[PDB]
Amino acid sequence: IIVASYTANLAAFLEERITGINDPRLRNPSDKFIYATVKQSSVDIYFRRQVELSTMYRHMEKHNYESAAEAIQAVRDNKLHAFIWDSAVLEFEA
Amino acid sequence: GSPRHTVPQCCYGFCIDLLIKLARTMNFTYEVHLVADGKFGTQERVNNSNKKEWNGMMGELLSGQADMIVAPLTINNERAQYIEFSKPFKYQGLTILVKKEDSFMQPFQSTLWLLVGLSVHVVAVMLYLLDRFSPLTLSSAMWFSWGVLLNSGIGEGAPRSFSARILGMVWAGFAMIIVASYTANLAAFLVEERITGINDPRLRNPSDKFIYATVKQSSVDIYFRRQVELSTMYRHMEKHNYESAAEAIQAVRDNKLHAFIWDSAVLEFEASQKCDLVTTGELFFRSGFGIGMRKDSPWKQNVSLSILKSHENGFMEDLDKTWVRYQETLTFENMAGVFMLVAGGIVAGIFLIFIEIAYK
Amino acid sequence: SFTIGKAIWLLWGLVFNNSVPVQNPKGTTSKIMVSVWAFFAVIFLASYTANLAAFMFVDQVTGLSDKKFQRPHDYSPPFRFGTVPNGSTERNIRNNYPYMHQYMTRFNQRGVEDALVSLKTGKLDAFIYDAAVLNYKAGRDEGCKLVTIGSGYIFATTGYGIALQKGSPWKRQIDLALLQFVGDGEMEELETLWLTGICSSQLDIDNMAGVFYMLAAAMALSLITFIW
Amino acid sequence: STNEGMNVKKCCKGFCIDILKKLSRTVKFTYDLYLVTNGKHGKKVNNVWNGMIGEVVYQRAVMAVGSLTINEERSEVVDFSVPFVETGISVMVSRSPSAFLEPFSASVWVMMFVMLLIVSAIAVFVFEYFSFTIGKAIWLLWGLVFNNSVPVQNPKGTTSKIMVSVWAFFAVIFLASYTANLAAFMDQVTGLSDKKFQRPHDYSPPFRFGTVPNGSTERNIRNNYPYMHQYMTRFNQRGVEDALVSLKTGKLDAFIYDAAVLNYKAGRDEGCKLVTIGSGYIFATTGYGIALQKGSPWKRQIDLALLQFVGDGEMEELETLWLTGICHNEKQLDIDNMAGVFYMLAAAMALSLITFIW
Ligand SMILES: *[C@@H]1O[C@H](CO)[C@@H](O)[C@H](O)[C@H]1NC(C)=O
Ligand SMILES: *[C@@H]1O[C@H](CO)[C@@H](O)[C@H](O)[C@H]1NC(C)=O
Ligand SMILES: *[C@@H]1O[C@H](CO)[C@@H](O)[C@H](O)[C@H]1NC(C)=O
Ligand SMILES: *[C@@H]1O[C@H](CO)[C@@H](O)[C@H](O)[C@H]1NC(C)=O
Ligand SMILES: *[C@@H]1O[C@H](CO)[C@@H](O)[C@H](O)[C@H]1NC(C)=O
């Protein structure tokens, strides 16, 4: 019975992020969708300007990180799922 | 159905006792005759001069063959402008009747099972012939050939397979890859019945599974034809036109239907009678059902006062007490055929064992 | 030849295909029913793996397409849901689904804060309300046990405006004032100042409970076989 | 460059022309039919309508006998008749195994046979260190792969039983991976809130989808999601025939249009290629109406004529005759896989005949 449940689990097994910029399942997150940003940033100002970034602003205020090093430490330990950040810095760090 | 067979029989029930109450309140003699067809009556065109006529009870009332329609008549636009009505005695709505209740051998196609049987027969015959031409013999050969396929454990040995072990190992892997592919594609094959109202997006464009119909040429069909924004459901119901309601009950009992528009308290009474016909908790089309009356006459007023006398007391409550209030890998229905075929195989195997004992 | 009274173990051990082989007699009697029970065990394990494949914490309410809101006869626990009495929410329900209003009319409630107290104590199962105010109240909730399931998937997701009389000349200047209020982030500044809010191989999280129940049953059977 | 034109006389047929002729039989009025020259069905651009809405609302026409969609703004500017047909919306898409031994096990097959020879050599070494495991370990090993209750000998060595147990656990996890592969081997858009229409980064090939301009479909999109209208603006197209050519050549993947009209185009399609997603289940499911002026006394007779045409099977006869039924919708058992297993079995019988004759 244990190895049959193992077989059914491997059957249910056979993707790190959906990556949707306007996906309503990503606009409205859940307890598993964890994503944060730098607290009081200009990127947060530009997200405050647009009107479809309301639920993401209400979710990223629940995990307000002080500096970017806390965000790097959070995404290193597989705690976050999205982080709006500059491109050339990530090309450097890759 | 029948060319000419009309006999005197006995009529009773709800409308008959209502007519007895009408005769008890005001004196009138009557004669109850049954209509020939089983339809309510629609505004049907006649074959000449572009004229629309009726049929059934209204076809006999306007032609002089009837005097009073005692039936659950639906008040609508076409029937109210032709004959006079009375006080509606019945207030009853419509609802949907559904059925809330795995291709193993018998629904599954029987080409490959006979193929595996003939294959293991040919394998046993050629292994017996190789046991003859070596580089209880037949009984041990059959024991090995049915113990390789057995796949659960048997107290056997190892036959002399100096030039036959390759055939045995390929047959073992062949039988296991067959049963593995069979388990895999059954689990892939076997991996939604409710309707719940007319406002359903799934039934805006039905198919061969979404089966729903109504009574042919009924007032419910007239009301659904009046709803012009329900054209596809009208197309689906006109292809499955049923004459009587008993045929609809027989079709929904024998798993030929999935939904049926019918009156609510009657289906509650049928749920009280039969446990396999239970509807949902919905109610719509609360239409008053009365008696279609004749033209200007004081006996229409006498019948209306008798119906008002039936309304002011608890006689309708007494009829509701005597009719409406009086009530009475699943391995329950899915594996019932599994149980029957396994029991038949057990009986056939026990019969073969007793024939084998009585022979030897 | 121990299959006189011990045929139960010899028949029930031919399912999980690792039993001790027992010498069958030479009359060709036991092997046929052993093969029949073996094929029955194979199709039973196939149906068991099919049931485990068809079986595939998660939320109980998916949205408007839930398998409970139409009729709770399919599932065993019942539920209840209501809105404000004689309000615009009832008309917004009746503009989309009258049957939802029919199932909601028998399960009405009185007050929104009373509905919150009924949800916390257990006198209510569901309550249809505006999602932004529920986010604001879950951000200040005592207990931190309110995560809003669904925020406009198959919902209405409408807006609010300023309704004047039919024919007012001030309506154009009010519209220009609203375009001034939107085009500088002042309305979002008010929404930020007033509205706020804070707070794989691990699928066998309930299977180990079944392992615990089967271990307790095995210890009970071992105690029964030990005392007698 | 100029507004000069000529009055070209053209003939008309179809469904709405039959409706107009039956209204001329019933209401008995002389018809003054002319095609619109302003454009498509209608879209208000700075309080200026175009098409049939621009003809009816601006007092240039009386009624709209032809097909016209219904939304909130067209219900506000004029009054429609009863909906005689259910024509909603839908999305048109493009729509343009041998065995389980050789295509699936080609690079793993050699290493599994290498592991089989290694385990057989280990079994021979254990049998010769301390009873047919001298050179005949192949039958024993590949019988213990499947474990079909084949007794061979009584294992007195602990090493042999440990190797058989480890090989049996490997066979169990290999059978689990094989059943997982068989389960993994067995529509596209299942809703308006799909992950594909919001962003094409769901999969690796990008796709495009758009609607028609100057229509009420764009207003129905903007009344629900203006960002979908923004992605349609990023994915603009030319016209209905141009989108049809783009679907035939492959320059367009999806196309949002009506429900029954794309069913008609699917039925008249050569080869039943262009097939919609389902049949229009969870879409808006709107209808068509006849728009008249607000205050027309002829509206009641047209409504009674439409109720006469629907309520006798004549409208059903028109919708059966003037619609297509060739291409239908959605056009455990396998053929080629057990055939290839039979070819490998015939090769196995050939090898057994070779080992039998020598
Ligand atoms: C009712 O009327 C009949 C005549 O139709 C008459 O013979 C009878 O005496 C009357 N009395 C009753 C039974 O009500
Ligand atoms: C025309 O005559 C036939 C004769 O059987 C009759 O059944 C039918 O109802 C008439 N009208 C129609 C509807 O064709
Ligand atoms: C019955 O009809 C008569 C006229 O024939 C009328 O005078 C009387 O009021 C009616 N009511 C009764 C007694 O049912
Ligand atoms: C709503 O209003 C009615 C009166 O129109 C009142 O009787 C009822 O109690 C109120 N409650 C509901 C059903 O919302
Ligand atoms: C809509 O119609 C106008 C002419 O009235 C035309 O100029 C315009 O190109 C059309 N819209 C689009 C974006 O195709």
From Swiss-Prot, chain A:
It is found in: Cell membrane; Postsynaptic cell membrane; Synaptic cell membrane; Postsynaptic density membrane. A hydrophobic region that gives rise to the prediction of a transmembrane span does not cross the membrane, but is part of a discontinuously helical region that dips into the membrane and is probably part of the pore and of the selectivity filter. Glycine binds at S42, D86. Glycans are attached at N28. Detected throughout the brain, in brain cortex, cerebellum, thalamus and olfactory bulb. This is Glutamate receptor ionotropic, NMDA 1. NMDA is probably regulated by C-terminal phosphorylation of an isoform of NR1 by PKC. Its phosphorylated state is influenced by the formation of the NMDAR-PPP2CB complex and the NMDAR channel activity. Belongs to the glutamate-gated ion channel (TC 1.A.10.1) family. NR1/GRIN1 subfamily. The chain holds residues 642 to 740 of 938 of the full protein. Component of N-methyl-D-aspartate (NMDA) receptors (NMDARs) that function as heterotetrameric, ligand-gated cation channels with high calcium permeability and voltage-dependent block by Mg(2+). NMDARs participate in synaptic plasticity for learning and memory formation by contributing to the long-term potentiation (LTP). Channel activation requires binding of the neurotransmitter L-glutamate to the GluN2 subunit, glycine or D-serine binding to the GluN1 subunit, plus membrane depolarization to eliminate channel inhibition by Mg(2+).
Curated annotation (Swiss-Prot), chain C:
Heterotetramer. Forms heterotetrameric channels composed of two GluN1/zeta subunits (GRIN1), and two identical GluN2/epsilon subunits (GRIN2A, GRIN2B, GRIN2C or GRIN2D) or GluN3 subunits (GRIN3A or GRIN3B) (in vitro). Can also form heterotetrameric channels that contain at least two GluN1 subunits and at least two different GluN2 subunits (or a combination of one GluN2 and one GluN3 subunits) (in vitro). In vivo, the subunit composition may depend on the expression levels of the different subunits. Found in a complex with GRIN1, GRIN3A and PPP2CB. Found in a complex with GRIN1 and GRIN3B. Residues 2-23 are annotated as: Pore-forming. The chain crosses the membrane at residues 28-49, 206-226. The lineage of its organism: Eukaryota, Metazoa, Chordata, Craniata, Vertebrata. Belongs to the glutamate-gated ion channel (TC 1.A.10.1) family. NR2A/GRIN2A subfamily. Residues 50-205 are extracellular. Component of N-methyl-D-aspartate (NMDA) receptors (NMDARs) that function as heterotetrameric, ligand-gated cation channels with high calcium permeability and voltage-dependent block by Mg(2+). NMDARs participate in synaptic plasticity for learning and memory formation by contributing to the slow phase of excitatory postsynaptic current, long-term synaptic potentiation, and learning. L-glutamate binds at S88, T89, D130. Detected in brain cortex, olfactory bulb, hippocampus including the dentate gyrus, striatum, thalamus, superior colliculus, inferior colliculus, midbrain and cerebellum (at protein level). Detected in brain cortex, hypothalamus and cerebellum. Disulfide bonds join C144-C199. The chain holds residues 598 to 837 of 1464 of the full protein. This is Glutamate receptor ionotropic, NMDA 2A. Residues 19-27 are cytoplasmic. Changing V133A: Decreased sensitivity to glutamate. It is found in: Cell projection, Dendritic spine; Cell membrane; Synapse; Postsynaptic cell membrane. Glycans are attached at N86. The record marks N17 as: Functional determinant of NMDA receptors. The gene is Grin2a. Residues 4-18 dip into the membrane without crossing it.
UniProtKB/Swiss-Prot annotation, chain D:
One of its GO terms (biological process) is modulation of chemical synaptic transmission. Changing Y257 to F/L/M: Strongly decreased sensitivity to glutamate. Residues 132-153 are annotated as: Pore-forming. The keyword Glycoprotein applies. Residues 134-148 dip into the membrane without crossing it. It is found in: Cell projection, Dendritic spine; Cell membrane; Synapse; Postsynaptic cell membrane. Detected in brain cortex, olfactory bulb, hippocampus including the dentate gyrus, striatum, thalamus, superior colliculus, inferior colliculus, midbrain and cerebellum (at protein level). Detected in brain cortex, hypothalamus and cerebellum. The chain crosses the membrane at residues 106-126, 158-179, 336-356. L-glutamate binds at S67, T69, R74, S216, T217, D258. It comes from the Eukaryota. Belongs to the glutamate-gated ion channel (TC 1.A.10.1) family. NR2A/GRIN2A subfamily. This is Glutamate receptor ionotropic, NMDA 2A.
